[PDB]
Symmetry: D2
């Protein structure tokens, strides 16, 4: 598998726990801001997901996790990371900075084959597991696994559109805090509301996720837009989609369509519950999107509100592994 990770942040580390869980193989990590002994500590301890159970240690300038030796690097510039020298073919680009094709192409200066951007890219091919993986051709060098909200929205939008046709829809995501937020009111020059104290506030925010679903499911291009509210919870978010449908249906037809899709073509991407769940019930959940049957409401036969949960750090990290496995199996077909 020969995966390398650039950025050992929330995503970077959990992509490694995902890899180990799914038997994938990471062979190199890079982060300027985190020296190897600090990498041990950050990998081992996690406030949201719990301590890594298994051995993590620094041994001979390498990070060794459960026997797996992983070569470390602390390069500030992507051009200077020796991927070739570690044996890393498939690079996961987790920094939140080399997101355009141009920028992620710096990983070619060190011998990387393919770059998977772990965020929406301005111009790299965006994929969402369960929804558009067949669009992936072997000549695609720099791809994107899109955002965490797009991976929750696009499964649910695919089922609603295929069965009842989405004429238009507006989305809100009630979203957990992230690392770009501030503990107390401080400077966020590009997003003034985003700098206000994260634990004190409900914070309106923008999201490009609904619009990006028009790239992943081309039929919906231009039919979806939305916004976010950031609220004080450490992880797990929820999509609230209000949709105008082309075909008359009951809410029970929407629940049966979600249940059938989660048992077959979207098995493991889309889950389904009828339980009285709340957001802590999905911490550690592996799926991209979990349809909450009892929280949605239907106003009329064509106007309805659907609720889908997602663990924004964890399900996404497992999908990064899934996109890699598929890319390899296609390129090694």
């Amino acid at each position: 598998s020969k995966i390398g990770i650039n950025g050992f942040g929330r995503i970077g580390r959990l992509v490694l726990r995902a890899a180990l869980e799914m038997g994938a193989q990471v062979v190199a990590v890079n982060d300027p801001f985190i020296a190897l002994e600090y990498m041990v500590y950050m990998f081992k301890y996690d406030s949201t997901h719990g301590m890594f159970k298994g051995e993590v240690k620094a041994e001979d300038g390498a990070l060794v996790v459960d026997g797996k030796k992983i070569t470390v690097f602390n390069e500030m510039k992507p051009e200077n990371i020796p991927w070739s020298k570690a044996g890393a073919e498939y690079i996961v680009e987790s920094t939140g900075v080399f997101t355009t094709i141009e920028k992620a192409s710096a990983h070619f200066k060190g011998g990387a084959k393919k770059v998977i951007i772990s965020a929406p890219s301005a111009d790299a091919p965006m994929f969402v597991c369960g929804v558009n993986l067949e669009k992936y051709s072997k000549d695609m060098k720099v791809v994107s696994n899109a955002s965490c909200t797009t991976n929750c929205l696009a499964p649910v939008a695919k089922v609603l559109h295929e069965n009842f046709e989405i004429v238009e829809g507006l989305m809100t995501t009630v979203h957990a805090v992230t690392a770009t937020q501030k503990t107390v009111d401080g400077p966020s020059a590009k997003d003034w509301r985003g700098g206000r104290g994260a634990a004190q506030n409900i914070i309106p925010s923008s999201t490009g996720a609904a619009k990006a679903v028009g790239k992943v499911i081309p039929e919906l291009d231009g039919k979806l837009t939305g916004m976010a509210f950031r609220v004080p919870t450490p992880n797990v978010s929820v999509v609230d989609l209000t949709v105008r449908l082309g075909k008359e249906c009951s809410y029970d037809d929407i629940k049966a369509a979600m249940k059938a899709a989660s048992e077959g073509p979207l098995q493991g991407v889309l889950g389904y519950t009828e339980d009285d769940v709340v957001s802590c019930d999905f911490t550690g959940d592996n799926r991209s999107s979990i349809f909450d049957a009892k929280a949605g409401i239907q106003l009329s036969k064509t106007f309805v509100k659907v609720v889908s949960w997602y663990d924004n750090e964890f399900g996404y990290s497992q999908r990064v592994i899934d996109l890699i496995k598929h890319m390899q199996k296609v390129d090694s077909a």
Copy 2:
């Protein structure tokens, strides 16, 4: 004014504060679970709204606030409260337990003239200041001031319906925690999700608010429904309204309509802002509904999402005093 308050909770205490602010006169309070010396403390200290600036003391069995003596009762049964001894005529019923005309009518036994339920009532006429006060008549003995979410939604729905016609709408309220929630996972038999730990969770919840706007604005009956997400913040909530409109418009038309109504017929009830606000900016705000111009989004000429903030404790408490002042003017003209 001769107002009496039954239930000295978040709403009961802040109605006293609003009354003192607006020069209204409370002459008696009743609460079985709060003894006079404890009422001093609870009124004096408020974790969300600050310490009361003024003298508060227990003197001769009364609560004395800035010189005014308030008779205190601690009667469990409404029919047993001697409202006539204190001279209390207009009774704010804020226990949350006597919300029907049958149950609220117990106050009449004690000599009360009028009862104002500080919650939706299944049968007492519901009022929202700035929207339907013209329907109140002096023979109405028991009235309701509806809920805090209906007082936010109904102003904004009035402006949109009058200018562009609401064909149908679905509402979400992202709502601060309340007193019925639990600090840790505990038993809430009639609402399982509502018993999960309030500080840890985004909790889906039901709201009658959008249905109740159909009773306040009769032409919207059956065209609106919605739900709540309870999130970990101590006060201030936001209504997210997705609406399908009868007339084509731009978002600038919606903003100009809201600005014009906050300057005229709805001044003091609906506010307007174009700043980068977050929920802590509305703590202590007196208005029922503050339209956030920059957070809404319009997908097409007839489908848009509108965001309005409300301090669910404080703005509602000022409206209770406003409704009472309107009623006494009608009952004495």
Copy 3:
């Protein structure tokens, strides 16, 4: 083992997860406020400790957890719970109400052998695993496993006293919120600070734990007292003990004494770390007390501050199982 539980609250449920983890056997549960289908939900979902992995279902009026059928009851009065009819010999008394010998003796009216109170008792024998289990005689019918803070304090106090002698000490516990607290300012007539909004505040509180250590380790009777600060975190607390010692020592002698005790006589009760830990690192931790080596400070050779972590719901629930196993093995010796 034939354990029964009265009160399926935070402790009641986690004592059952502890039992299942440790192969103990629970055969009956009682709680008026929780009907069997709601018991399934509360056992299955836990905001702090995660979903029970394994099957939980209601089957023939019994709760069935991983194959174990458990007889349910919903008695409001302890005298009316048929322990005899379920086969429950050893009762765990988790309600927070039948804490005196008198009150816990109501479980004899239904055929219970022994009662383990899961809180400090005013007069039942208090035990702390690793510290005074040899004081337990077979004739003791109603015992107490003391408080969660006493189970964290007494291990650490036992090591400091045995090695250096505690002349006097003062304790603070920075303690996570509990179920007796309120989401927003509400009535707590017996503890006015305890009613103020739990997520908004640092709340001074009393604790009897330091004083109770004088009952568990008689030599320290009268030498320890302390207080609590309740802070907004859902679980895991920390003891901050400032102690005046009889013998001159360095801080490294205190760390070596804690490490030796955790490897031998207090193995599994007292743990030891030198890592840069924070409270989420101990969620799910099984030990009663985890000495934090790097956070303590020594001012002089006889005056020092020691920091010990504890998961107040979880380690305590496992110790309830441990006290039961020891009681049985002594009574079945």
Copy 4:
């Protein structure tokens, strides 16, 4: 007054607010990361302290607050700030980065007369209002106002030492989060515990505060040390001081001593309360230290625990203005 502020952060903005409240005159502000139109917004809205009641606007390249024009600079290097163009003489240095006399001396290049570091300095004389202002002399060019915790601890240590003699003491501060903490687990290389998610954790931390009281009250040098626990609240902290005393006393003697000092030599700096207060009761409090009479405990005649509250942002900011007013009186008498 002719005050200039360098760094327009929590402390920089609240010193402007304190100055306007106390009729002091700020004539210039400098901050490289905050443009003039963004400074309007950040000063106008405050999630902890409320919206500024007054007009705030950007006019002709200046910040105009209630009529007063303030020249704005956005210089990264202190030696480059044209303080003399604006007429700024007394410079509040609140960036947190130029805390030594060498580094703070950069302001002299621009024409500043005096610099007040709003933090502990390794070498500038440290002052605490009400405790050692008498030591300031007009030849002192760079002074420090110490930290917020030293300003809480030093009043209370002064009263105890003067009346009962402190033999030795260990301090804990349970402290609100600050701007150096992280919303989720992220990199803090020089302080690993400090990078763990601030909203989820009780985080042990170091504090120089108790050592620094030894420099402010020379007779306490080497007799006090302590630590911090950072807990999830946005403002207001509490000092928990365990002290061994030279003279035998009762707790009523300690309370009477504190009451007497808050009425005389320390009025306005040390407050006193006997109510059931919690941290939200001190948001916006002007005092440096509020002795909580009911929360302290005395184990014996010479060993006791004292609790004092402080609004770490607001009371400290008023003391910055107080220190400056004292200095100008000495520099012009």
